[PDB]
Amino acid sequence: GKGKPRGLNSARKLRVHRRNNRWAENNYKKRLLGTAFKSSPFGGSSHAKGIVLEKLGIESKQPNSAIRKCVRVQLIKNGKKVTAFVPNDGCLNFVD
Amino acid sequence: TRSSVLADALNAINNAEKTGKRQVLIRPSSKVIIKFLQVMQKHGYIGEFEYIDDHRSGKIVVQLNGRLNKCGVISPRFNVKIGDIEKWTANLLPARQFGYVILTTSAGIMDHEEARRKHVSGKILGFVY
Amino acid sequence: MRAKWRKKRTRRLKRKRRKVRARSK
Amino acid sequence: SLPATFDLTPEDAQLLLAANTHLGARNVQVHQEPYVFNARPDGVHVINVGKTWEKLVLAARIIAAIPNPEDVVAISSRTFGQRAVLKFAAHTGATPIAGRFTPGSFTNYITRSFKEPRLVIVTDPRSDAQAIKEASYVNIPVIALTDLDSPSEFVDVAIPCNNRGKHSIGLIWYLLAREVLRLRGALVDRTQPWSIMPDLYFYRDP
Amino acid sequence: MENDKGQLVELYVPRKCSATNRIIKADDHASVQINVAKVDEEGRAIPGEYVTYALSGYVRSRGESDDSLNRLAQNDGLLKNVWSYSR
Amino acid sequence: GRVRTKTVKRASKALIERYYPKLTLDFQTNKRLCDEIATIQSKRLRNKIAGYTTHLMKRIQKGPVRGISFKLQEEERERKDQYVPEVSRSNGVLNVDNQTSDLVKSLGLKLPLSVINVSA
Amino acid sequence: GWVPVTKLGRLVKAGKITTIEEIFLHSLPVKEFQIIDTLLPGLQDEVMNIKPVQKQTRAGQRTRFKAVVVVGDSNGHVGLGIKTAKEVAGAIRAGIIIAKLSVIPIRRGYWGTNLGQPHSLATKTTGKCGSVTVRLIPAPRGSGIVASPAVKKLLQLAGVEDVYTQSNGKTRTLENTLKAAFVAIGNTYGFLTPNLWAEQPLPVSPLDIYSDEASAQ
Amino acid sequence: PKKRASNGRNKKGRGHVKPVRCVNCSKSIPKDKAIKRMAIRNIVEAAAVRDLSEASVYPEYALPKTYNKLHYCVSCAIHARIVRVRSREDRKNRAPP
Amino acid sequence: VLVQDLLHPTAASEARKHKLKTLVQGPRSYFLDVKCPGCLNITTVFSHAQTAVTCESCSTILCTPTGGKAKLSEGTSFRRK
RNA sequence: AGGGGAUCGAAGAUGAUCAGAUACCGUCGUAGUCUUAACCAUAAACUAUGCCGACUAGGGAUCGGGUGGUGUUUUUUUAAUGACCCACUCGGCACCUUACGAGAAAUCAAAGUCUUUGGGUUCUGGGGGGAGUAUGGUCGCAAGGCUGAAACUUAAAGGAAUUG
Ligand SMILES: CN[C@@H]1[C@@H](O)[C@@H](O[C@@H]2[C@@H](O)[C@H](O[C@H]3O[C@H](CN)CC[C@H]3N)[C@@H](N)C[C@H]2N)OC[C@]1(C)O
Ligand SMILES: [Mg+2]
Ligand SMILES: [Mg+2]
Ligand SMILES: [Mg+2]
Ligand SMILES: [Mg+2]
Ligand SMILES: [Mg+2]
Ligand SMILES: [Mg+2]
Ligand SMILES: [Mg+2]
Ligand SMILES: [Mg+2]
Ligand SMILES: [Mg+2]
Ligand SMILES: [Mg+2]
Ligand SMILES: [Mg+2]
Ligand SMILES: [Mg+2]
Ligand SMILES: [Mg+2]
Ligand SMILES: [Mg+2]
Ligand SMILES: [Mg+2]
Ligand SMILES: [Mg+2]
Ligand SMILES: [Mg+2]
Ligand SMILES: [Mg+2]
Ligand SMILES: [Mg+2]
Ligand SMILES: [Mg+2]
Ligand SMILES: [Mg+2]
Ligand SMILES: [Mg+2]
Ligand SMILES: [Mg+2]
Ligand SMILES: [Mg+2]
Ligand SMILES: [Mg+2]
Ligand SMILES: [Mg+2]
Ligand SMILES: [Mg+2]
Ligand SMILES: [Mg+2]
Ligand SMILES: [Mg+2]
Ligand SMILES: [Mg+2]
Ligand SMILES: [Mg+2]
């Protein structure tokens, strides 16, 4: 009979079972693990400033061939090296 | 084992009119089955039903015309207070005009329209249309 | 590779981890 | 409602029991037949013939309802029904189908066997179930010669004959063509046998 | 299918299966209408004067069309013997 | 491999259905007959058609052959039907089971009485 | 001219039967498009969707075209049929015709109150085709048709001005979407409501009363 | 998915059954799955009729017929014996022919 | 099927059904007053035996039990009630 | 850890085979295979399908029990048997036909009674991978069992059916 307990007094077993099961919901999990604040290069914030280490052209996956101008950046607030992409045409000549 | 007798009876009923049959044997009757069948009868979804006598809980033979689509039990007997009877109806009843949510109150087993006018509420029971 | 031999690979490798880690005790 | 006259006559009783129409099928019988009476020992069941005659009456009382008697349809694929339907057809209005049914007749207007009855008579609801299928798409009531084992699906006004063979097919066929004339047609008065022999409808090997 | 005051609206009040009292709708193509002719004294069948029934598609498919009409006609007077209401 | 195609047997089919009178079994009559009735653009085809519709005829006289009906046979069956000499009841009473008899007395009365037993 | 076959189809060329509603009443199997062409000429054709389908042929690659068409007017009748030709516009043509053979009565109704000229639906009806199930619920006046544009358009030619919708199954596959949407309203008359409890005499067949005006040569 | 409602062969309510080794390739196969044929033959054959009873004593002596039951592993079965491939439908037929 | 009388089913088709599954359950066993004229009078026995009975005076065998009704030993008469 | 140890036979030894052939096939043969005492707790441990309860449909077979029969065999002589037959009925291993219904489909008498959504209850799952990995706890003599994350990565993986 769809084994969820029907009882009028089964409230706990009902709300516990769903509490138990929201962990399968992914970014529910990521909410309560703090993963925003714990890992990931930004603090859990929109943007972050950093400093260019190197200018690295990345070759794109198939079925495309390009060299995608990128930058190794080290986050000021944070210290993590992180690798970011420069948009549009040239625009790598704006950094060094 | 057996948990809701009423549910068991409202079953073979729906299992009758889905097979076309005009007569269904139900066992082991009840006090509520009676009053529920009564409410069903009085609004015209069944014919006359006869509680027979064994010495245990009895049986019943229900005559059903075919005017019925679905009757059924609401399995946990839910507290509904007067302001949620509307809410409850709107879910399982085909359109505003007809059909009945039947429930149980301290004033006796009755539908929502009878409930409205007496203006008492209670725990939910079942539904008929 | 076959799930069973992949299973045996993972076991071979993980009995090697206790060894290398035992040496650390 | 019945007239006192049309209850089963011992002439018909002896006509019926001649062909062995009373004698039903073996260990296999579908539930849908109460028509059984007191199963015959060792592998037969005895049909109630007055209930068979009343059905025969109700068949005629229905066969002659349909305004134009010619687009009523009797059908037999069986060898044992093939002659019996022609004679039913020539006498009454009805147009027959004897032998292969050529499926696509009741639907598929572009077909050259296209028919459009208001009713259908069937000798063997098994072998002719093909038509019973077709009639179930087009809203066509259907009469069926039936034994005890026969597929009650999608047929009305069953008649409880013996479709196993010999004389029983055309017998119950002949009495039906007989009674449709005895209602709203030129023919015999009370107690009068029919000059047409019941053996007219029959099988020829030769 | 009435309205505010008076008038009957909503075209096509549909039939009903006489056997199961079920609405028989436009697309039910195993549904059937039986025309049984009412005869008169001396057996003549009176063309155009009918005892009619409607039979739903469901009843015919189940194999109940036979026993359904037998019940339906006999209590309407067109037969006796045959069908037993009790079994 | 001598086998007539469909354009030959369909012609031969539709010819005899409407033209069975005339159309004697003899080829050369039918062949010449074809030119005045059916239009065919080939010498050979006409002869191929003819020779087959010939065959249909030659067998038809021994009784029907499937696929073709000109309606003349249809009621030739109707009047060809007869020959019942002996229908049933004689010489004696109705031979019937124990139970079949038990049915009679239930719904009615008058029947001649003969009943024997059965088993196995 | 027309030149009908089909006893049902002949009887309407002569002026015997005035409207479709009696074809329904007797559950008559319309086998011809002209019947309902002439019975309700104010129909509109709407092509909905066209997608190509490709058979792998023992020699070849067959890419034909499948079209879906909803037809109807504003009142109680809608067709839905799906035709696939070897060319596009030809598939719409034979679709509108097959959609016409399909058309079906639609019982509108009053949401909560009697008042004027029904808008919403009789009851709650749920059609199911493939994975897609489509639920129609009564709505008040001015709620309008609440549904995707593709089911909305079929509920316009259906003549409903007010209905709520819930959609289940994979609704991006249109054939089963509408096919279930069409079955929902196509079920509206299968619901035996108490105002329809009233006893009715069972009228007799226009194929009978006009029997001689029908039939053959 | 399921190619049979008999699964391999013929155990419902049993849950284990002793196996048997194949006569040909000696593969272990369960006895209910064993796909067996009964091999009965005269110790003689077609060509042996005449040279037998005439080179004997006795008024014909009649004749013994060999008996052993054969079991096959379904891999070597299909390689040779009564086996092979049936349409999805015909696979349902259980009759010998 | 599809219509039948549940209230008034045939006693002939009833008596084929199981003792529990009839319209009202009741036992189908009986009681017989059994006689060994070696005794002037009767001891009244239940039909399905279990205990294999003796007559009040002498040690003697009326029945021996089986799963169902008992084997009534050799000559005896019986009255059902 | 004792006994046992015929046969078959992971390791290993080999003869052939292949371009190679640590294999397939042939041959020897250790542990094993059996058993007593203690451990281990896993298998596609499968019906890949929770348990209790109600209901929803025909058909012939079959297992065990029970009821009926001026039924057949045995005979020694009715009997009592004992098997057989026929019918009914419970409880079982299954099977056929169906499809009112269900479903993505293959198919399902349940996988049916579901948007007309509620009989009671247990368990699990929430894209693929990373991974049944790391770690901690715990069980084991050991192999291992149990519980069991994340970082990162990725647009599909996937089911049934269709045509080639
Ligand atoms: C065979 N395993 C099944 C699994 O397939 C599934 O089964 C459901 C079943 O529980 C639902 O059924 C359930 O809900 C019904 C409500 N209408 C009534 C009660 C119950 N049988 C079915 N409607 C659909 C199946 N696939 O969920 C339950 C289960 C036991 O795990
Ligand atoms: Mg917890
Ligand atoms: Mg957790
Ligand atoms: Mg998990
Ligand atoms: Mg911050
Ligand atoms: Mg670098
Ligand atoms: Mg809701
Ligand atoms: Mg290893
Ligand atoms: Mg060290
Ligand atoms: Mg488009
Ligand atoms: Mg809106
Ligand atoms: Mg496979
Ligand atoms: Mg297997
Ligand atoms: Mg196992
Ligand atoms: Mg040892
Ligand atoms: Mg050894
Ligand atoms: Mg080696
Ligand atoms: Mg190789
Ligand atoms: Mg090789
Ligand atoms: Mg060896
Ligand atoms: Mg298994
Ligand atoms: Mg099971
Ligand atoms: Mg498992
Ligand atoms: Mg199962
Ligand atoms: Mg798991
Ligand atoms: Mg992920
Ligand atoms: Mg695990
Ligand atoms: Mg995993
Ligand atoms: Mg594991
Ligand atoms: Mg661990
Ligand atoms: Mg311990
Ligand atoms: Mg430890």
Ligand SMILES: [Mg+2]
């Ligand atoms: Mg991409």
Ligand SMILES: [Zn+2]
């Ligand atoms: Zn093998």
Ligand SMILES: [Zn+2]
């Ligand atoms: Zn004594």
